Amino acid sequence: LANKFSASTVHLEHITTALSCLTPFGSKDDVLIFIDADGLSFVRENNHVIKIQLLLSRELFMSYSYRNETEDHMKLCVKINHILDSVSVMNRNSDDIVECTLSYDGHGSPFVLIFEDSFISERVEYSTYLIKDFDTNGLELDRERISFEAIIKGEALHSALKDLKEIGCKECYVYAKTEANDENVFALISKSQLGFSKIKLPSNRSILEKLQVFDGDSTTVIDGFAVIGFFDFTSFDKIRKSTKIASKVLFRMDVHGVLSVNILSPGIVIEVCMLEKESIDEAAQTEIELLME
Amino acid sequence: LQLPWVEKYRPQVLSDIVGNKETIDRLQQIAKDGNMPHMIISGMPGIGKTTSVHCLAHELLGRSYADGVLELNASDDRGIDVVRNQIKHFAQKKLHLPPGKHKIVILDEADSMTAGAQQALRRTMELYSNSTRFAFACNQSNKIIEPLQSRCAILRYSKLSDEDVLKRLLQIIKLEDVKYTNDGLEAIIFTAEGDMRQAINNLQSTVAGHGLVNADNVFKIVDSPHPLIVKKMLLASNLEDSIQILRTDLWKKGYSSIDIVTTSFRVTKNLAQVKESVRLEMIKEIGLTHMRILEGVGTYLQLASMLAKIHKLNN
Amino acid sequence: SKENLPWVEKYRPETLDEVYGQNEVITTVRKFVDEGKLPHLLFYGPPGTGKTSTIVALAREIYGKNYSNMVLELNASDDRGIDVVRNQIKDFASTRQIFSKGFKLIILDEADAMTNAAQNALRRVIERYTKNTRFCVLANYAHKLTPALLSRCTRFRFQPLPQEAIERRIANVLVHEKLKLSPNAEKALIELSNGDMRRVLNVLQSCKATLDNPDEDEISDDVIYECCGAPRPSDLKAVLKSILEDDWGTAHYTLNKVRSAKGLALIDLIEGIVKILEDYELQNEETRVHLLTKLADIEYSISKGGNDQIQGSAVIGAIKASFENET
Amino acid sequence: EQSLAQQPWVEKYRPKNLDEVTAQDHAVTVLKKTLKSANLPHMLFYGPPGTGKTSTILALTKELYGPDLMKSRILELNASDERGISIVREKVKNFARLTVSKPSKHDLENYPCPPYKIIILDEADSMTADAQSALRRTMETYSGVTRFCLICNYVTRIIDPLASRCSKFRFKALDASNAIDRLRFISEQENVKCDDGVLERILDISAGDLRRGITLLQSASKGAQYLGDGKNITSTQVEELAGVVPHDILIEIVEKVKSGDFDEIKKYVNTFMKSGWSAASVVNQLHEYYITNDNFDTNFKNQISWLLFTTDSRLNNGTNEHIQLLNLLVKISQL
Numbered sequence A: 001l002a003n004k005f006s007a008s009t010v011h012l013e014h015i016t017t018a019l020s021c022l023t024p025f026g027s028k029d030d031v032l033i034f035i036d037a038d039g040l041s042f043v044r045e046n047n048h049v050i051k052i053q054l055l056l057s058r059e060l061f062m063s064y065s066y067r068n069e070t071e072d073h074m075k076l077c078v079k080i081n082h083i084l085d086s087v088s089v090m091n092r093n094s095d096d097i098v099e100c101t102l103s104y105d106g107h108g109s110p111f112v113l114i115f116e117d118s119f120i121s122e123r124v125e126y127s128t129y130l131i132k133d134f135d136t137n138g139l140e141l142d143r144e145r146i147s148f149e150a151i152i153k154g155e156a157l158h159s160a161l162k163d164l165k166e167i168g169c170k171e172c173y174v175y176a177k178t179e180a181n182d183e184n185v186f187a188l189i190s191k192s193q194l195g196f197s198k199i200k201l202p203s204n205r206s207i208l209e210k211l212q213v214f215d216g217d218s219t220t221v222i223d224g225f226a227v228i229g230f231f232d233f234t235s236f237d238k239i240r241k242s243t244k245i246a247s248k249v250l251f252r253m254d255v256h257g258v259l260s261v262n263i264l265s266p267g268i269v270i271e272v273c274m275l276e277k278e279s280i281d282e283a284a285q286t287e288i289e290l291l292m293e
Numbered sequence B: 001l002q003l004p005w006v007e008k009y010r011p012q013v014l015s016d017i018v019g020n021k022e023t024i025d026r027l028q029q030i031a032k033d034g035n036m037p038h039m040i041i042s043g044m045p046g047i048g049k050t051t052s053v054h055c056l057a058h059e060l061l062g063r064s065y066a067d068g069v070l071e072l073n074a075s076d077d078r079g080i081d082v083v084r085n086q087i088k089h090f091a092q093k094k095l096h097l098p099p100g101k102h103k104i105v106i107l108d109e110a111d112s113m114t115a116g117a118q119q120a121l122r123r124t125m126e127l128y129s130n131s132t133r134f135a136f137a138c139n140q141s142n143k144i145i146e147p148l149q150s151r152c153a154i155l156r157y158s159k160l161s162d163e164d165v166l167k168r169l170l171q172i173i174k175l176e177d178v179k180y181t182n183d184g185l186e187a188i189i190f191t192a193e194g195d196m197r198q199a200i201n202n203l204q205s206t207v208a209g210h211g212l213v214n215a216d217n218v219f220k221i222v223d224s225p226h227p228l229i230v231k232k233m234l235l236a237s238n239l240e241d242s243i244q245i246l247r248t249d250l251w252k253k254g255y256s257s258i259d260i261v262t263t264s265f266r267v268t269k270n271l272a273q274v275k276e277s278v279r280l281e282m283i284k285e286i287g288l289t290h291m292r293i294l295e296g297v298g299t300y301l302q303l304a305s306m307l308a309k310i311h312k313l314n315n
Numbered sequence C: 001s002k003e004n005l006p007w008v009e010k011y012r013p014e015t016l017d018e019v020y021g022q023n024e025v026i027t028t029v030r031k032f033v034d035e036g037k038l039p040h041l042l043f044y045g046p047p048g049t050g051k052t053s054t055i056v057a058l059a060r061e062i063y064g065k066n067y068s069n070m071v072l073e074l075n076a077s078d079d080r081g082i083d084v085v086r087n088q089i090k091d092f093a094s095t096r097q098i099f100s101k102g103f104k105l106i107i108l109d110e111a112d113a114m115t116n117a118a119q120n121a122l123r124r125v126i127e128r129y130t131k132n133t134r135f136c137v138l139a140n141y142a143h144k145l146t147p148a149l150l151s152r153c154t155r156f157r158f159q160p161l162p163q164e165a166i167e168r169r170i171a172n173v174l175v176h177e178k179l180k181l182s183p184n185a186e187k188a189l190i191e192l193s194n195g196d197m198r199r200v201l202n203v204l205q206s207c208k209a210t211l212d213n214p215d216e217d218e219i220s221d222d223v224i225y226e227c228c229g230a231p232r233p234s235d236l237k238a239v240l241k242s243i244l245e246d247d248w249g250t251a252h253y254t255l256n257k258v259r260s261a262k263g264l265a266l267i268d269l270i271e272g273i274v275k276i277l278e279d280y281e282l283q284n285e286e287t288r289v290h291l292l293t294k295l296a297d298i299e300y301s302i303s304k305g306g307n308d309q310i311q312g313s314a315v316i317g318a319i320k321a322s323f324e325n326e327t
Numbered sequence D: 001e002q003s004l005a006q007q008p009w010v011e012k013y014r015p016k017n018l019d020e021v022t023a024q025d026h027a028v029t030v031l032k033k034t035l036k037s038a039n040l041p042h043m044l045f046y047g048p049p050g051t052g053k054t055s056t057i058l059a060l061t062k063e064l065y066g067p068d069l070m071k072s073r074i075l076e077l078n079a080s081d082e083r084g085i086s087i088v089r090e091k092v093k094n095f096a097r098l099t100v101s102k103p104s105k106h107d108l109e110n111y112p113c114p115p116y117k118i119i120i121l122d123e124a125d126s127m128t129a130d131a132q133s134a135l136r137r138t139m140e141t142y143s144g145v146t147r148f149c150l151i152c153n154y155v156t157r158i159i160d161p162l163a164s165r166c167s168k169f170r171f172k173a174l175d176a177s178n179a180i181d182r183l184r185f186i187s188e189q190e191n192v193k194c195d196d197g198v199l200e201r202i203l204d205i206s207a208g209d210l211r212r213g214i215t216l217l218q219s220a221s222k223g224a225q226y227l228g229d230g231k232n233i234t235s236t237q238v239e240e241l242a243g244v245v246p247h248d249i250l251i252e253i254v255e256k257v258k259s260g261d262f263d264e265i266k267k268y269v270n271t272f273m274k275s276g277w278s279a280a281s282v283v284n285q286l287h288e289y290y291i292t293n294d295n296f297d298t299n300f301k302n303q304i305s306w307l308l309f310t311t312d313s314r315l316n317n318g319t320n321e322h323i324q325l326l327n328l329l330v331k332i333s334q335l
Ligand SMILES: Nc1ncnc2c1ncn2[C@@H]1O[C@H](COP(=O)(O)OP(=O)(O)OP(O)(O)=S)[C@@H](O)[C@H]1O
Pocket: B005, B006, B007, B009, B010, B011, B016, B017, B018, B019, B043, B044, B045, B046, B047, B048, B049, B050, B051, B052, B138, B139, B168, B196, B197, C123, C147, C148, C151
């Protein structure tokens, strides 16, 4: 096509899955679209405290063309509600849709989405908006100061998130500890109307693939030291829908109070970065210690 | 970093709170005894109500403070559902405490609580008074519904005197080793208008700007309370003097006309010298000028005409 | 990009050194940031004095060029109800810095437009999270701020811009442009500014437009008055002299001629005459009372429209009747 | 020809380009050179009715973009639209944040196409203070891609911050001195035959409103065409159409006022209100008669000027015409 960017696919599941994953960040707000030869990424942020980035690589599309030469990437901003409503109305006959094509012709042009059926094609153009001064790259994990890392099965984490949601969890605490004899302890401690509750992940290489505590430098492994991260459940729970489709989840917490969750479902990949609370109250610390000891 | 002095020097014990000597002494008596009843603490901003309630709770509950205190303010959810679930469950909790000690529910800024929540609080107070006690903190005691007031001891905090403010300022200065002069402390106290929070903020600002707390240095940053300027403007025996005050001290300093008229109404309400007829006529003229300002004509000429009418009435 | 911007925005100060007129406030805030002891701030002042510019420049200085990542700015264009305070502001103030870069900053611009309930909810958010976060509240009308919020903020007053600062900024703009301003034009611009830099910049841009060849044409007072459509001081003096000395017919004719020469509006003539009369030495004070009351009434009536000729005749009659007292 | 004759003369002869706008050169020059400078600021047009504010902004928008591009670069809102605080915070803000649309090759070839949009808020004085406050930082932040144009008759109804933000353009009243050329051109286009000074009389009666003058000219032309006598329109016909009270009736009123008898004045006013004369016109004519008369003294003129101002201000508040007129006449008779 003559457009600067044009990608067409025959798998409508990826698009609807991406919209489903982006929904928990607000049904009425902005979404940033990054386009480059590598692929197309959707980015959303909430309250300068949480961020989600979902990537769609070239392989997911049966055709992918990025003809821009002046710039190696293109940035645009759209309204999530517009896309949601348009797709919901257009995707009513999901059995008949055979092709979906996204297109963009640079700054000043709309983001074009076309659903192509056997004999009927529906073309929608979404108006674009100026991108906010806030930089998505601002909230990122310091790769050189990882406090701890862990690998978890998607099903178990999703079930734990469901349990936390169903009890009205208000505050969440991620507890990670390592000892000798390949002993690992990863747990989520919730403060809710029920009081303090705990969900412990088994120390087996079936759900908790690996856990390591790096002493805040990503290099030296230390045993007997517990890393505790305090988060508001309002932000922590936003990864539930991404975990629903997740095959594996990688948690990485740094010393600056940043938690990164990498979710793997050729495929859809998600990265959620969240900030932790300033400090943990004495009562919460005592209750966590009592629960873990 | 370095905390602002207002929070850095927040009193942590009841013995460090200045002013309201009788009320603070009674709070100390309650703390040493234990039999704390439901209480309401009312007063103007920045006089120590929140600090007093927190210090009393800490002294009463000791190490059990974490499990024996439930604090809620206007920044938290405090609707009827909160009363139905969170406060009810806290009051139902069985906590072993030393004899004469009860759990404490602190409701800061209780005035802002909704009517439904306040009405719901009646039954929980009736049912769980044997193990739980309520401390309301507010600025207007009348904004708490009467059925709740009926169960509590009232405690009204008065404005701090210059002596108490000076004593606390001297303690802070000694702790910080700040160089000052008597006129500077006088200016700080005069500009604080009885608010200790403002006094501390102004002292910190002056120290940061110049270090030495003199009168001129204080008045470079801090401004005399404009209510006093408005009172002087209203009480001037000459029309030209009132106009000169309005021009030099208020208009050219950047004070908005709406603020000037609202302050004029507030001040005229409290003029003890004037007669009732003159006062009510001045109020009428101020109201008419306020109506004109709200419509968009917020000009200096309107305020000058208001002053001319007030002077005419004084004659 | 900046070239296409209106001058009021193209000349927005970037650093604190570019802010003029507020020497005391700038000095104090610069020393506070130098020691890193910034308290909760209130910037109170009239329009176009540098409040928003000053706070943005301070944020830039504190956080360098990456201030947009750890500063939460909200204004009247955003909804700031009690729910917003409870959720968004609360979560921002209760979370760690991006890279442990000291404390976070929340700017509440035009906070006088916030509701009482939201301001009440703000009290404990400000108090509890003071260690990690600092608040800045900007306002033009203090009576809209609750006493509790005012008590919590260190107050700084932005005065109307002095003449010297306006002259310096005008010189900077003239150098940046290829423009030439006469001293009389500068005096007229300062007089009409009333301490607002925005008006100065807008009038300067319009004057540059008015010039046929700005590369060599110089702005004179006549250009300023043409652009603003305002009366000249000579016009005001002539009208006042005719009112105070000439008979009714002559005064009416003089007012009509002066207004029709350049299409002057009556309100500006009244304002200029009031400025002139404020300095008059009157032996009878009752004259001032009559002048002020009648002219304020005429201004209020004009604000709603009405008959222009009747209003002008009313101004003439009011001045004459008031000055009959001096007799 | 019938289609071109489907429009009232005010709409028919609305200026198409900025060159057609008359008597407002002080602002038209700035707006015109903005086409080359591409430095359009936020604007606040203010002035009395029928002076050419809406026409000027429409002509500017047409000149800047063109018939096609305009639709994507203009957002117009007026008193007929809902403009609550929520509207300002959502719709106006979204448009102000919208990316600048890409012009076509034809548009670039034919029009300057500045890289920003325009939001026109006509009758801005009807908006509430809070809604106006909601516009401040929206205008400041997105000035790189959006420019605002507020239009009003009562500038005092605009909050001070918005007035400071906007560059102000006062539109002057259109009288017989500065607007006669346009009215003469309109009369020549429609082949209106009027006696010398008729256009002067229309413009003096209109009192700064060219729209009213054009409507009066159209009414006179219709009357003359219906008569079909081929004769020139007369000033008396114009005064009759305008609702001006005949000089003899005014003389009778003045004589009654001079007599001073309350009952006679009341009876005459009761009979005079039968004809349905508008009290505003009568008050204006009485002001003209008395203020310019050389048979009265200075104190009389001062007192009558204040009385006339009070009566006119009361009438502006939609008061009851008979009562106000009778009160004014009784007061004058007592001078
Ligand atoms: N009596 C006092 N003695 C010493 N410091 C005081 C006193 N009152 C206020 N302060 C100081 O100002 C700060 C605030 O005091 P508060 O107890 O919060 O006043 P407040 O009456 O509760 O204000 P409101 O009603 O919540 S606006 C304290 O941390 C102290 O540093």
